[PDB]
Design a protein around this ligand. Structure first.
Ligand SMILES: O=S(=O)(c1cccc2cnccc12)N1CCCNCC1
Lengths: 353, 13
């Protein structure tokens, strides 16, 4: 076979230990999922510094906690915009999931609260910037560099999917680089606890699996498709289904045809053809062997999965950090003062937040 | 040709 006796037994034991880890992680998650935290701070506890990124419902700002002086990233959502965009359920998903998960590559939620106008989620500040910026600046990542990041996403999805959580918005814009060069996944706005199928048409066009575009009930395998898109974009510098307008992007995705740069290794192309697989009976991550089809693929042969989890692998890139609260690794955005009404808006819709 | 700037999520169709 491919593995000798020693290698086979080591791999088997490793895979059993994964099951043991995930069973304990589920027990811990369920305790927090059934008894969530709420109202752990208030707005006047923080000084607002600078906008770090924007979204449809608001922005994320660097804030400084007045009492402790610690810096945080505060996501601000305008309740009125959330209701109009039918994102009430999604925003409740985001907060509930973030408060209950625990993994080295998932951003940590520290506080959450609401006022008359807005919802607030206060997270650890990750100063190294978005992967997106670094990728666009350099052009592309070499295969070992891309593989280091991809391995962290594989482990993060193995964790999330074991908890019946689908992520649904993988892309470089949502992956921050920490002070050690490791990934922090942010933006749980589309994450959802799903036992089997779900039906919402949501995500980012370039990263959507064909079954989403085709209005099928879909499952966690959409995240494994998106991993294929991410790995391709990291290694090529552009995604595999690339067009100016969403309708044109969707047409390319459902055709299934993928072309690869001549510099892609054959191992990489083989992995990507198995992730970017339109037939769900053949897509890696959706088969009997589960995540192991990905983790044991030749492209990951040099990956020490435990060492990645333990953050003991030397990172390919360490962001420059000029001190606590430095924002040099983030782009600039138009600033807008946070307005808080004298009247409570959308109170009944956000009671559980 | 395609989109090189930051890409916003979509909530429907
Ligand atoms: O970088 S963020 O501002 C950001 C979000 C969440 C937590 C963060 C923690 N540290 C820095 C930046 C953070 N961000 C928001 C814009 C939409 N794309 C995701 C990135």
């Amino acid at each position: 076979g491919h593995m000798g006796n020693a290698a086979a037994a080591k791999k088997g034991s490793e895979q059993e230990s994964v099951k043991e880890f995930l069973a304990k992680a589920k027990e811990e998650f369920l305790k927090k999922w059934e008894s969530p935290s709420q109202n752990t701070a208030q707005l006047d506890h923080f000084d607002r510094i600078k906008t770090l990124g924007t979204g449809s419902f608001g922005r994320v700002m660097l804030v400084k906690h007045k009492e402790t002086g610690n810096h945080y990233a505060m996501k601000i959502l305008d309740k009125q915009k959330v209701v109009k965009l039918k994102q009430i359920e999604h925003t409740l998903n985001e907060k509930r999931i973030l408060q209950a998960v625990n993994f080295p590559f998932l951003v940590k939620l520290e506080f959450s609260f609401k006022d008359n106008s807005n919802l607030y989620m206060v997270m650890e500040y990750v100063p190294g910037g978005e992967m997106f910026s670094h990728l666009r600046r350099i052009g592309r990542f070499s295969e070992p560099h891309a593989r280091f990041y991809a391995a962290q996403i594989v482990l993060t999805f193995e964790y999330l999917h074991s908890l019946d959580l689908i992520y649904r918005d993988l892309k470089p814009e949502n992956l921050l680089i920490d002070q050690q060069g490791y990934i922090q996944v942010t933006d749980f706005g589309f994450a959802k606890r799903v036992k089997g199928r779900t039906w919402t048409l949501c995500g980012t066009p370039e990263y959507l699996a064909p079954e989403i575009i085709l209005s099928k009930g879909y499952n966690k395998a959409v995240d494994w498709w998106a991993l294929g898109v991410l790995i391709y974009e990291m290694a090529a510098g552009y995604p595999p289904f690339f067009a100016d307008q969403p309708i044109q992007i969707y047409e390319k995705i459902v055709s299934g045809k993928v072309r690869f740069p001549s510099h892609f290794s054959s191992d990489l192309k083989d992995l990507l053809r198995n992730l970017l697989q339109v037939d769900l009976t053949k897509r890696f991550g959706n088969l009997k062997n589960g995540v192991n089809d990905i983790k044991n693929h030749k492209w990951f042969a040099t990956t020490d999965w435990i060492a990645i989890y333990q953050r003991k692998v030397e990172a390919p890139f360490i962001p420059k950090f000029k001190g606590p609260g430095d924002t040099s690794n983030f782009d600039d955005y138009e600033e807008e003062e946070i307005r808080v009404s004298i009247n409570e808006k959308c109170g009944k819709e956000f009671t559980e937040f | 040709a395609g989109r090189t700037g930051r890409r916003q999520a979509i909530h429907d169709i």
